[PDB]
Amino acid sequence: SPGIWQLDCTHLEGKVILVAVHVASGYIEAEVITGQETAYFLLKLAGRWPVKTVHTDNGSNFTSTTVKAACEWAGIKQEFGIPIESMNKELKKIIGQVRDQAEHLKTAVQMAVFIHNKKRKGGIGGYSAGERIVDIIATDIET
Amino acid sequence: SPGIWQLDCTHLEGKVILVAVHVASGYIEAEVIPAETGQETAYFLLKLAGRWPVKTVHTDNGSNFTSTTVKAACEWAGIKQEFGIPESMNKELKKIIGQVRDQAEHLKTAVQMAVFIHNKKRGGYSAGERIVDIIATDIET
Ligand SMILES: Cc1ccc2oc(C#Cc3ccc(C(=O)NCCOCCOCCNC(=O)c4ccc(C#Cc5oc6ccc(C)cc6c5CC(=O)O)cc4)cc3)c(CC(=O)O)c2c1
Structure with missing residues (x-):
């Protein structure tokens, strides 16, 4: 399902890291950071990928006026229950x-994101997450 | 033109907007950056190359050749810089902004709304559809 993402947070050196996983591929985006910031993050993601449903596991984004606005503008459905915590773990190990x-930590996070998306998901041969997401999307448009 | 991008600067509301264009598709990414070409230009490029295949980056003035951090970012990620950018996306973007x-x-919000529109709106295929098609095609090769 090409447009389904999970959004979660995590923390390092007193900063918060916003993490979005395309569930079907394992492709991820991330950034260091509010509700404006998440809104901006979601807008940027949706203008780059098909962002159709975003799952989160707590109540925090449902109370953010800008997120609600970004989701309406962009056409994103927030859904509670998520439906990738091993994800936050491998990201930090790479970091x-x-x-x-x-x-800058921010640069470190983006180095780690780069490695995550470009390495072979299986260690050897096959696809990377970065290849799979495009593969998934190519086939959904085709259909 | 599978990993070939153009990089340029455009200006609005007293701010600088960095814009990378995937030449074969017209797909763009954009962010508000400093007048200085340095750390934050390197970071934009690192982030871009983590999401897409970025192998060669063209520019057609000298600014992008005067930062050691940009050079270290290109080395780290496997990006070649080429001079010569022989693509007035900047004009439709500002229209949309x-x-x-x-x-x-915030201006940068309006930039990201305009990127979204430019990449999603076609007819035939949108820029967003094109780049995915291009990259998927290649992978199968
Ligand atoms: C080898 C190598 C490779 C790469 C490398 O790279 C680097 C680097 C670097 C490097 C990068 C970066 C900095 C750096 O950041 N510098 C200073 C900047 O600091 C401030 C940060 O905080 C930002 C937050 N500020 C905001 O103002 C703000 C305001 C509004 C919103 C929103 C929204 C929104 O969204 C919406 C969506 C929808 C709707 C409807 C409404 C909204 C709305 C509402 C609406 O607008 O209405 C958000 C934010 C510094 C340094 C290195 C160097 C190194 O490290 O070795 C390096 C080395």
Whole structure:
């Protein structure tokens, strides 16, 4: 299902990291950060990918006027219950291996996102998450 | 033109907007950045190359060749910089930003609304449909 994403948060060095997983592929986006910030994040994602339903596991985004606005503008359905916590874990491990390469945590997070999406999902051969999401989307339009 | 992008700067409301165009599809990504070409240009490129295949980046002035961080970002991710960008997306974008500007407080929000529209609206195929088709085609190769 090409447009289904899970959105979660996580924390490092006193910053919050917003994390969005395309569930069907394992492709992820992320950024360091409010409700405006999540709204902006969602708008940016939806203008790059098919963002149709976003699952979150707590009440926080349902009380954010800008998120609600971004979702209406963009055509996103928020849904509670999510339907990727091993995701936040591998991201941080990768952030561990790159952190020394970067002066800003933000850069480290984006190095780790890069690695995640570009490595072979299976270790060897097959697709990366970055390839799968495009593959998934190509086939849904085709249909 | 499978991993070939154009990079440029456009200006609105006293701000600089960085814009990368996937040449074969016309798909664009954009963000508000500093006058300085440095760390935040490197970061935009790192992020872009994490979402799409970015192998060669064209520019047609010298600004993008004066930052050590941009060079380190290109090395890290496997990006070649080429001079020569021989694509006035900047003009339809600003059209659209002006269309949607009232719908948002922050300019950068209006930029992202205009990116969304430009990439989604076709007829034949939208830029967003094209880039996916291009990349999927290639993978199968
Ligand atoms: C090898 C290599 C490779 C790459 C590298 O890269 C780098 C780097 C770097 C590097 C990057 C970056 C910085 C850096 O950030 N600098 C300073 C900036 O700091 C401020 C940050 O906070 C931002 C938040 N500020 C906001 O103002 C704001 C305001 C509004 C909204 C919204 C919304 C919205 O969305 C909506 C959506 C919909 C609707 C309907 C409404 C809305 C609405 C509402 C509406 O507008 O109406 C959001 C935010 C600094 C440094 C390095 C260097 C290193 O590290 O070694 C490097 C090295």
